[PDB]
């Protein structure tokens, strides 16, 4: 497992959609899968998403205060996901990215979504999630269609830097 | 001249809208504008506002290859200025702020405006201003009115990290 370099917000490669994955359980997936799980270790991170170690395919992993009533969800690998959002509720709450060092900004979303898709064996997943994450979820998927959470944002009162945001 | 902490996006300070300076030609302001001064300089930046140094008062100064048919300008302090914007040609050109370090976004603003307002000694200012000029006025006038350069992004594919956006 090595640790690979995270893009950070204006590489135009985290602006692209990610491509399907079309081969499961192979060598060089379960590297992939390895090395996200190393760099998202490194940084301290809920989730990844591969583009943003510089992989154009749809590959997020996730797993782990301000959540407190959050239940922790084991490590996730999700291949091709299929979001469903669930109108109406929404949550606001803080995020920041590792493609967007330093900041938080507070993002509207769904509080509550539908995923599936498949894992690195090509074994189908198929859950509801809630609150953190559902958060998580969305926030990873969002990398895959090329969106980083200042777009999202719609109040920049609220964006800013970690540093003085949180002292 | 002392050199004076610059606060960054997050913190309430910037949001809030400035109060006009009451009284012109005192030791106290001369302070502030020397202040001001050498914290630009030391920065590299083309213009600053007082409320980015914890003051809150409608006082900005200004004068300085993104845009090499800029004349310059001579060092300028404006006081509680009065902005007048020129529609209906905009220019989108790149900005950043010392508020926000490290990045860089593309913004549109008037390509012309007229300012008035004074100096720090109570003279009266009166300009017509194009092209640069106009845009680092309209970028220090925001300082005044709570807003820092996000706010006024519309296309966030064009916002992120000076040191990725220009290597
Ligand atoms: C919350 C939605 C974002 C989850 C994923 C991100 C990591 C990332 O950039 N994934 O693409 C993360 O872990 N972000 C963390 C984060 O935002 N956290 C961690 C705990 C609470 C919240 C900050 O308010 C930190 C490490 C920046
Ligand atoms: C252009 C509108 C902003 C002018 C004022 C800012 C400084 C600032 O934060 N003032 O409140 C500046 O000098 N910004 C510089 C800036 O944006 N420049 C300098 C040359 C060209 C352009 C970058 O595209 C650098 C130092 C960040
Ligand atoms: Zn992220
Ligand atoms: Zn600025």
Chains 1, 2 share one sequence.
Request: hydrophobic share 40%; net charge negative; charged share 25%.
């Amino acid at each position: 497992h090595m640790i690979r370099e995270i893009l950070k917000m204006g590489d135009p490669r985290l602006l692209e959609v990610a491509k399907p994955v079309a081969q499961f359980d192979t060598p060089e997936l379960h590297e992939i899968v390895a090395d996200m799980f190393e760099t998202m270790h490194h940084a301290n991170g809920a989730g990844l998403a591969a583009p943003q170690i510089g992989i154009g395919l749809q590959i997020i992993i996730f797993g782990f205060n301000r959540y407190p009533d959050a239940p922790p969800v084991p490590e996730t690998v999700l291949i091709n996901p299929k979001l469903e959002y669930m109108p109406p509720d929404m949550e606001e709450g803080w995020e920041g990215c590792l493609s967007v060092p330093g900041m938080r900004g507070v993002v509207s979303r769904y509080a509550k979504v539908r995923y599936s898709g498949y894992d690195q064996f090509g074994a189908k997943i198929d859950r509801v999630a809630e609150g953190f994450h559902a958060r998580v979820v969305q926030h990873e998927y969002d990398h895959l269609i090329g969106k980083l959470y200042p777009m999202r944002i719609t109040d920049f009162t609220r964006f800013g830097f970690t540093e003085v945001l949180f002292p």
